[PDB]
Design an enzyme around this catalytic site. Structure first.
Site, PDB file in Angstrom:
ATOM      1  N   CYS A  36       0.804  -1.228   0.000  1.00 39.27           N
ATOM      2  CA  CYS A  36       0.000   0.000   0.000  1.00 39.27           C
ATOM      3  C   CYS A  36       0.836   1.276   0.000  1.00 39.27           C
ATOM      4  O   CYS A  36       1.563   1.572   0.955  1.00 39.27           O
ATOM      5  CB  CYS A  36      -1.017   0.028   1.171  1.00 39.27           C
ATOM      6  SG  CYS A  36      -2.039   1.573   1.185  1.00 39.27           S
ATOM      7  N   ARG A  78       0.053   4.719   2.780  1.00 42.89           N
ATOM      8  CA  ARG A  78       0.138   4.537   4.238  1.00 42.89           C
ATOM      9  C   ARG A  78       0.514   5.781   5.052  1.00 42.89           C
ATOM     10  O   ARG A  78       0.432   5.765   6.268  1.00 42.89           O
ATOM     11  CB  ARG A  78       1.066   3.378   4.584  1.00 42.89           C
ATOM     12  CG  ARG A  78       0.472   2.024   4.257  1.00 42.89           C
ATOM     13  CD  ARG A  78       1.456   0.900   4.592  1.00 42.89           C
ATOM     14  NE  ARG A  78       2.458   0.722   3.548  1.00 42.89           N
ATOM     15  CZ  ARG A  78       3.581   0.030   3.687  1.00 42.89           C
ATOM     16  NH1 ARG A  78       3.900  -0.515   4.864  1.00 42.89           N
ATOM     17  NH2 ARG A  78       4.408  -0.094   2.653  1.00 42.89           N
ATOM     18  N   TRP A 134      -9.110   6.352  -1.003  1.00 39.68           N
ATOM     19  CA  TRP A 134      -9.441   7.035  -2.260  1.00 39.68           C
ATOM     20  C   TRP A 134      -8.463   6.572  -3.349  1.00 39.68           C
ATOM     21  O   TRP A 134      -7.389   6.054  -3.059  1.00 39.68           O
ATOM     22  CB  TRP A 134      -9.402   8.564  -2.121  1.00 39.68           C
ATOM     23  CG  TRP A 134      -8.155   9.081  -1.466  1.00 39.68           C
ATOM     24  CD1 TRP A 134      -6.941   9.319  -2.062  1.00 39.68           C
ATOM     25  CD2 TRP A 134      -8.003   9.419  -0.085  1.00 39.68           C
ATOM     26  NE1 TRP A 134      -6.045   9.798  -1.124  1.00 39.68           N
ATOM     27  CE2 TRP A 134      -6.674   9.866   0.095  1.00 39.68           C
ATOM     28  CE3 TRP A 134      -8.859   9.387   1.022  1.00 39.68           C
ATOM     29  CZ2 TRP A 134      -6.187  10.289   1.338  1.00 39.68           C
ATOM     30  CZ3 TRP A 134      -8.375   9.800   2.256  1.00 39.68           C
ATOM     31  CH2 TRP A 134      -7.049  10.252   2.400  1.00 39.68           C
ATOM     32  N   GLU A 145      -4.636   3.490 -11.004  1.00 39.92           N
ATOM     33  CA  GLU A 145      -5.445   2.295 -10.762  1.00 39.92           C
ATOM     34  C   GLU A 145      -6.547   2.213 -11.800  1.00 39.92           C
ATOM     35  O   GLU A 145      -6.786   1.160 -12.384  1.00 39.92           O
ATOM     36  CB  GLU A 145      -6.081   2.304  -9.369  1.00 39.92           C
ATOM     37  CG  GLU A 145      -5.055   2.352  -8.206  1.00 39.92           C
ATOM     38  CD  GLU A 145      -5.731   2.277  -6.844  1.00 39.92           C
ATOM     39  OE1 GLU A 145      -6.164   1.169  -6.475  1.00 39.92           O
ATOM     40  OE2 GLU A 145      -5.806   3.301  -6.129  1.00 39.92           O
TER      41      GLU A 145
END
Ligand code: HEM
Ligand code: HEM
Ligand code: H4B
Ligand code: H4B
Ligand code: HAR
Ligand code: HAR
Ligand code: ZN
Lengths: 411, 413
Positions: free
Chosen positions: B110, B113, B282, B287
């Site tokens: 991720c 973070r 969000w 992506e």
């Protein structure tokens, strides 16, 4: 033991058995993965198992495993190590070894070409002037007026470690870097230390932005010597853009022949500390890395300004737009001058086909995903979606320390 | 080894990791093989559970500066007795919140973070039925969406007991588009969700059969067969995609949803397993713009865009794919920003991540990170993460993969 890798785009699955032949280690452990870390003489007893391992694979490859010729050779080599503490490869063995070191190179996307390598045996070289001659002949053969051909030149193997041959250069052809009075760097910042070494050794530096470095060659453990590659053997390409006429005014060029010269070739336990090799460029190497890394020529801002992009906010993707244009220019310039270059789409597609071949005929293909996936447009290339297993097979190309950190200057 | 160094090759900053010594779980790698590019490499008894609980409570109590206190010691005693007598235990609300925040903090894949400390945790452990789960999930969606000003959130349903009474969300994300395989072999909508869509239809969903149909929720409470629910349309925020310069872009008919809400992972805290734990933040633009739109096995729009751009598509070396990719991504960011829906570009996100990572090395002794996932899927080396060496290891509390429930569910009929 038998491992599977999946392509997530195509759902094709391959089975790897070849990794079970790796003796060398990765840097990873069961608790920690170091897949993104850049960098994670042999005694008699050390040498015979390594030689045996190699000779077994060689004899297997020519369908004479367990033959009298096979057994004869092991004994011969065994007697030679016993007697002389080292041994000499037959020419057939050297050629097989070098080709396989390329085959095993986990970070190389161009390995579909592996079996076509031209191997130049320079093991009879004794002096630095001889090295210079061998290297010019390599450059001329490989360059081939722009129709590039893969090649490697192999100088004498290490003996006692105090008579090493080394090319001090990191590639046969590279540009100088000069720290300036005003804090900046002129030229290629990657090469500042080596340029200083050349100067203190005698080089009269031109002090421009694209000065082809001189060769600094070490024969037989001697102090290294300076030599200039005939200017007329160094093919360069001026960079222009098919649509932007202002691009040529940036004054950019690059050289046609990528020739890594600082690595060490291991074959059958023998160590070849000077083994320059060359292929041809993938476009992103120059246009993405050499040109746009902040610590390299760092040209993105200058290009973006000339395209008049909105550079007030990252979310306009001005960096991204300029990047594609720089890379378009690189490919177009090399293609227009008839100098071999491969784009990242074509090269990655070839590699996926090579992997499948290797899985089918060899039981696997060691690949380092972190290096194989190009530094731009990653997921629109097929390698992004391909799982890979990284492991170390020999013969191999290895990193070795820069020689100025370990050279005992005889003076 | 006690100290491991990582180097940034663009800045020459070296960082020292000691946090890896607290890693427990295994990577899939060995001394002889790296599996760092493998997507998925390789109930608890009382004996297994007490050390995992103690490890966690020592971490919790240490975090609040009450390590070794009577409060600490009593809580250990209380949990030990609870495990002994019931074979499991219940987390305090404060421990649940701490655990969920730490699972995010610890998630190596991720890039978001820097935000970990601000997660809103919704405690849904009093939930007993699929209808109850539906109501919890609607509340999560409305809260997280916040009319476009997105807030990170997680909803935590009851933990696993015997493995026969699991809560599961069968959706892979709370909001996703249907995909339909046609008889001619083509796909309408999102090919990633064809299998789940077929399951939904079988369970009774009347599919609109369009290109962007929001899937119904399929919810399993207490090991029972899952049930279908439609998310109220008014709670699903979507953005039509347009380009700031190309007025033909809108006529491609593209849109996407504002809230990315992974719903199929398992959250482990102190040995306990939370099999239904949907979480949302969000979007980072790539992506949608790189993967969801341009992957060959997703919406696959690259050719259509390039054709409309009149790029030379005769040869890859024109870089027509790359030029079209940048424009699509400019469009995604422009559209979200214009509708005032939170989104982050890959430059901003990766810059923030490097600052977060450096901060974590300094105050925590490390930051486990998966380079393969962290580096964005376009323009990799013009982001600072490409140049940063990372160390990947597995800390708990943790988010883990679990098998899709249709492969494991015992149908009650
Ligand atoms: C023939 C065309 C070739 C192509 C298109 C090609 C492609 C590439 C590329 C794009 C890289 C990454 C370089 C970087 O990021 O700095 C690479 C690395 C590498 N290649 Fe090749 N290559 C070719 C020929 C060769 C040959 C002839 C050899 C050896 C005989 C070889 C062995 C290696 C090795 C050892 C690496 C890793 C080097 C390092 O660690 O810095 N390649 N290759
Ligand atoms: C708040 C803004 C956030 C941003 C910008 C962000 C960014 C990202 C991105 C871009 C990915 C890669 C996703 C993919 O390629 O499919 C990812 C993965 C991941 N994130 Fe986040 N994230 C955010 C919030 C969260 C939250 C709230 C959690 C948990 C509480 C979380 C935990 C994870 C996990 C476990 C993964 C790996 C998922 C997998 O393996 O499929 N993230 N993040
Ligand atoms: C830190 C990270 O390992 C580093 O920046 C790597 C990334 N992948 C690479 N890939 C290639 N082909 N060449 C490189 O120099 C790099 N460098
Ligand atoms: C095979 C490879 O691991 C695979 O395609 C990975 C690559 N890196 C990734 N990175 C992110 N963020 N998301 C992904 O789905 C992928 N998939
Ligand atoms: N393609 C090759 N070799 O055949 N590359 C060798 C390394 C070159 C280095 N990446 C550069 O851009 O100068
Ligand atoms: N940024 C997040 N979460 O906040 N992403 C979750 C996964 C979303 C997935 N990559 C998609 O494109 O739908
Ligand atoms: Zn690894």
């Amino acid at each position: 033991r038998f491992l599977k890798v999946k392509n997530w785009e195509t759902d094709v699955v391959l089975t790897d058995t070849l990794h079970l032949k790796s003796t060398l280690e990765t840097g990873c452990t069961e608790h920690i993965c170091m897949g993104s870390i850049m960098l994670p003489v042999r005694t008699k007893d050390q040498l015979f198992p390594l030689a045996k391992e190699f000779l077994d694979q060689y004899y297997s490859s020519i369908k004479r495993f367990g033959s009298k010729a096979h057994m004869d050779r092991l004994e011969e080599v065994n007697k030679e190590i016993e007697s002389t503490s080292t041994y000499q490869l037959k020419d057939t063995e050297l050629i097989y070894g070098a080709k396989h070191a390329w085959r095993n190179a986990s970070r190389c996307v161009g390995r579909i070409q592996w079996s076509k390598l031209q191997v130049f045996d320079a093991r009879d070289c004794t002096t630095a002037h001889g090295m210079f001659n061998y290297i010019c002949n390599h450059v001329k053969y490989a360059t081939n007026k722009g129709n590039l051909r893969s090649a490697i030149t192999i100088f004498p193997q290490r003996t006692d470690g105090k008579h090493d041959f080394r090319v001090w250069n990191s590639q046969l052809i590279r540009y100088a870097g000069y720290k300036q009075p005003d804090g900046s760097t002129l030229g290629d910042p990657a090469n500042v230390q080596f340029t200083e070494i050349c100067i203190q050794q005698g080089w009269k530096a031109p002090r421009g932005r694209f000065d082809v470095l001189p060769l600094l060659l070490q024969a037989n453990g001697n102090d290294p010597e300076l030599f200039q590659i005939p200017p007329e053997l160094v093919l360069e390409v001026p960079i222009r853009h098919p649509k932007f006429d202002w691009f040529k005014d940036l004054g950019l060029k690059w050289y046609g022949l990528p020739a890594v010269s600082n690595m060490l070739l291991e074959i059958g336990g023998l160590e070849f500390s000077a083994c320059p090799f060359s292929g041809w460029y993938m476009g992103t190497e120059i246009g993405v890395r050499d040109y746009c890394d902040n610590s390299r020529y760092n040209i993105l801002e200058e290009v973006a300004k000339k395209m008049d992009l909105d550079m007030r906010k990252t979310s306009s993707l001005w960096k991204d737009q300029a990047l594609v244009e720089i890379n378009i220019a690189v490919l177009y310039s090399f293609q227009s001058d008839k100098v071999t270059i491969v784009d990242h789409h074509s090269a990655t597609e070839s590699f996926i086909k090579h992997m499948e071949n290797e899985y089918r005929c060899r039981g696997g293909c060691p690949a380092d995903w972190v290096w194989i996936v190009p530094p731009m447009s990653g997921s629109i290339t097929p390698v992004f979606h391909q799982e890979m297993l990284n492991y170390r097979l020999t013969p191999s190309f290895e990193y070795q320390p820069d020689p100025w950190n370990t050279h005992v200057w005889k003076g």
